[PDB]
Amino acid sequence: HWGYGKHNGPEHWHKDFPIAKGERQSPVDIDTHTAKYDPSLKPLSVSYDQATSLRILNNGHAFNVEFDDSQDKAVLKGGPLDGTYRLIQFHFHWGSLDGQGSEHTVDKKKYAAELHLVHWNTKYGDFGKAVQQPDGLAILGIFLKVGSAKPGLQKVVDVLDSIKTKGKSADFTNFDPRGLLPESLDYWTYPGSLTTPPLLECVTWIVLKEPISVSSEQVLKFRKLNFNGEGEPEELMVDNWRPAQPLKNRQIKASFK
Ligand SMILES: [Zn+2]
């Protein structure tokens, strides 16, 4: 019964998920001055040409755009990564107001939202096994700020009325996630965790520096979703972000000077 409410939110999660207080929890604040350029890092390789979106699901905490991950069709490689990681889903975290919503922060700055493209390491054969490994997942994080519209986001926004409440899904084929990427692939990277229960410490985080712009109207539509199920009291799905966690014995590396 974890969530983001007044009485089941992030500060409570440790009771059911004690790793919430672990050594490699996410998100974190990215202190840009102390992140060090690492010339050994390689460009990332984001290969989404063959991606097969299938469905969009309101799971009660966010909405997931789900992919076919039964072959290497949409893969993330390079950067800090050893080997090949399959896109399984993307989702967002966002605020009730434009001044908040991101999970990672940059010199304590909160963005309006944050996109997570979740990929699992093909060495481990599927997702459930991958989350049990320290290098099981690679999550590409992309900040959203409010300004111009993101044209490539609009098809997502327009389907949200059909998945207003927890447990609703809709067909969502032929969506191209390349339309959610910023211009630059410059990034920060560090070892961390899932940001939702079970908070497993299985993620190589790759957080892009360049945000994407979305319009006020687009984020407003995110904020019309519901945490609740159909026929239940309405609870707007807003502020579904975990705050920054202690960095502990980690270094954040930059791909760029
Ligand atoms: Zn996330």
DSSP of 215-247: -HHHHHHHTT-BSSPTTSPP-B-----PPP---
Residues 150 and 156: their CA atoms lie apart, in Å, by 11
Helix (H) or strand (E) holding 157: helix 154-159
CA distances from 16 to 9, 11, 199 (A): 12, 11, 11
Residue with tokens 């790759």: 206
Distance (angstroms) between ligand 1 centre and the Cα of 27 equals 9
Evaluate whether 89 touches 169 at the Cβ level (below 8 Å): no
Q: Coil, strand or helix: which one is 85?
A: strand
Tokens of 181: 């990427």
Residues in a beta bridge with 94: 113
| b (16+ CB within 10 A) / e for 105-139 | bbeeebbbbbbbbbbbbbebeebeebbeeebbbbb
> Is 7 known as a binding-site position?
no
Distance (angstroms) between ligand 1 centre and the Cα of 48 equals 19
| DSSP symbol at 179 | G
Distance (angstroms) between ligand 1 centre and the Cα of 63 equals 10
DSSP, residue by residue, 87-123: EEEEEEEE-SSTT---SSEETTBPPSEEEEEEEEEGG
> Is 33 known as a binding-site position?
no
Distance (angstroms) between ligand 1 centre and the Cα of 126 equals 19
Resolution (A): 0.9
> Is 1 known as a binding-site position?
no
Residues 66 and 179: their CA atoms lie apart, in Å, by 16
Give the dihedral of Cα atoms 37, 141, 5, 145; nearest 10 deg: 90
CA distances from 164 to 158, 207, 236 (A): 11, 29, 10
Residues 6 and 165: their CA atoms lie apart, in Å, by 19
Distance (angstroms) between ligand 1 centre and the Cα of 195 equals 6
* E strand map for the chain: 29-30, 36-37, 44-47, 53-58, 63-67, 75-78, 85-94, 105-106, 113-121, 137-146, 169-171, 187-192, 203-208, 212-214, 253-254
Distance (angstroms) between ligand 1 centre and the Cα of 35 equals 22
Tokens of 51: 């991606």
Solving technique for this entry?
X-ray
Question: Which of 116, 234, 115 lies closest to 165 in space, CA to CA?
Answer: 234
Residues 215 and 251: their CA atoms lie apart, in Å, by 34
Residues with a known catalytic role: 61
Residues 253 and 255: their CA atoms lie apart, in Å, by 7
Distance (angstroms) between ligand 1 centre and the Cα of 205 equals 11
